[PDB]
């Protein structure tokens, strides 16, 4: 079937606070498989997040 087609472009980001663990005093982010995790906190620290 091809009689119509709808636009299906990317997802935006999504939340996953299962990532933000704790490094025994600091909040610790991780990554799925090397995916692109977009990161900073209300305080001043790493401001974009394109990381492991």
């Amino acid at each position: 079937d091809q009689g119509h087609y709808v636009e299906m472009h990317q997802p935006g980001l999504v939340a996953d606070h299962s990532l933000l663990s704790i490094h025994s005093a600091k909040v610790k982010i991780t990554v799925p498989s090397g995916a692109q995790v977009k990161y900073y906190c209300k305080c001043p620290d790493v401001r974009e997040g394109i990381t492991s």
Partner: nanobody
Amino acid sequence: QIQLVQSGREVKNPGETVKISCKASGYTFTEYPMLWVKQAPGKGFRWMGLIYTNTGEPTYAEEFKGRFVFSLEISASTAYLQINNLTNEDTATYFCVRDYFISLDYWGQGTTLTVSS
């Protein structure tokens, strides 16, 4: 491999300022920030704060927000501690330290200040 070599020990009369250097060797400065610790003569070890050697933002321990100022000669792999308006009870030894492995892995030699007229 990793060597953090610190400046030598100073004497300063109350009121003065001091800049203690920490020259880093063996790692890429930029991926590991610096811990500044005060081991006071009797009292034991205390965290003074941490500096993001990437952005340059310092965190101060509340005990140290004020007269203490962290900075870095990025370019030369140096981190520095500056204690302004020296108080007599600041005599102690200050260590720079590398934060890595969910803690601190390397400590410097120490720079001892003796505030004294």
